[PDB]
Amino acid sequence: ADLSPEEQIETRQAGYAFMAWNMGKIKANLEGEYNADQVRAAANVVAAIANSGMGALYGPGTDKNVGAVKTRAKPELFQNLEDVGKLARDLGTAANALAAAAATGEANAVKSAFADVGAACKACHQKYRAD
Amino acid sequence: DLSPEEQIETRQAGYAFMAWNMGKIKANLEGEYNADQVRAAANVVAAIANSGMGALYGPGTDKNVGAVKTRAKPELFQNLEDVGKLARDLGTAANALAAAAATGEANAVKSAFADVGAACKACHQKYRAD
Ligand code: HEC
Ligand code: HEC
Ligand SMILES: [Cl-]
Q1: Which residue minimizes the CA distance to atom 29 of ligand 2?
Q2: What distance in Å separates the CA atoms of residue A14 and residue A16, rounded to the nearest whole number?
Q3: What's the CATH code of the domain at B79?
Q4: What's the total number of domains in chain B?
C-alpha cells in the first residue's frame, strides 16, 4: 500500500496542478470582479495542499522518469532536500495566510497574501523544477 | 478559461489528490491514529470537494483529447444536475469530516470518513467508466 515511485510522481504532480488551477481563480477574481466565496474555496485548496505533507512524495527512485511518466523535478532538488523542505514550509505558511486573508472577504488582503504565495511557488520552481 | 484537455487533466488531478489523502486517513484509522495527520488530510478532501469541480465538466470534455484520455462515462454528461447533486453529497460529507477532524472528534471522524467514501462510490457507480 506504499506508493511506488511512479505513483509518488503522479500524486505530487496532481497536487501541484490542482493548486495551480485554484491560484488561477484567485488571480482572476483580483483582476476582475471579486467573488469572495470563490476566493475562499480556492485559497482553502492551496492552503490544504501546501500543508498536506508532499515531501513524502519525493522518495527514492522518484528522480527519474518512469516509462511514460516523466518528472520535471531537477537533480538539484534531490541534492538539496533540506532546502527544498524549507521552501515547502515557506509555501505552507504563506498559503495558510492566504486562506486566512480570503476568510476576511477583503480583496486587498488577499492581493498581498496571494503575492506572497506566488513568490513561494516561484522560489522553488526557479531552483528545482525544469521548464 | 481552461481548454477541454486542461479540464480533464485538472479534474483527474483533484480526484487523485483526494484519494491519496483518503488513504492517509484510512491508515490512521487502521493503525496509530494521529489527530494532526487526520486534520491535514481531511482539510485536503474538504477543500477539493468544495472547489467548484463541476466547472471542469465543460463541453468537449466528454471525449478523449489526443493523448489525454478521460474515464468519464458518456452518461455523466446526460445527467449533469445529478452529477452535481452527487458532488454536493461529497462536499457536505467532506466538510463534516474536516469539521470533526479540526475539533479532534475522533468518533465523528471515523463515521464521516465512511460517508465520504460512500459519496465517492455513489458517483463512480453511475458516472465513471471502470
Ligand atoms: C518546494 C518546491 C515547490 C513549491 C513550493 C511549489 N512547487 Fe510546483 N513543482 C515543484 C516540482 C519539483 C515540480 C515537478 C514535479 C514532478 O514533475 O515530479 C513542480 C511542478 C509544478 C507544476 C507542473 C505541472 C504539475 O502538475 O506537476 C505546476 C503547475 C506547479 N508546480 C504549480 C505550483 C504552484 C501553483 C505552487 C504554489 C502555490 C507550487 N507549484 C509550489 C516544486 C514546488
Ligand atoms: C460527483 C462525481 C464524483 C465524485 C463525488 C468523486 N468522483 Fe472520482 N471520478 C469521477 C469521474 C467522472 C472520474 C473520471 C475523471 C476523468 O477521467 O475525466 C473520476 C476519477 C477518479 C480517479 C482517477 C483520477 C485519475 O487519476 O485519472 C480517482 C482516484 C478518483 N476518482 C477518486 C475519488 C475519490 C477518492 C473521491 C471521493 C473522496 C471521488 N473520486 C469522488 C467522479 C467522481
Ligand atoms: Cl429538476
Answers
A1: B16
A2: 6
A3: 1.20.120.10
A4: 1
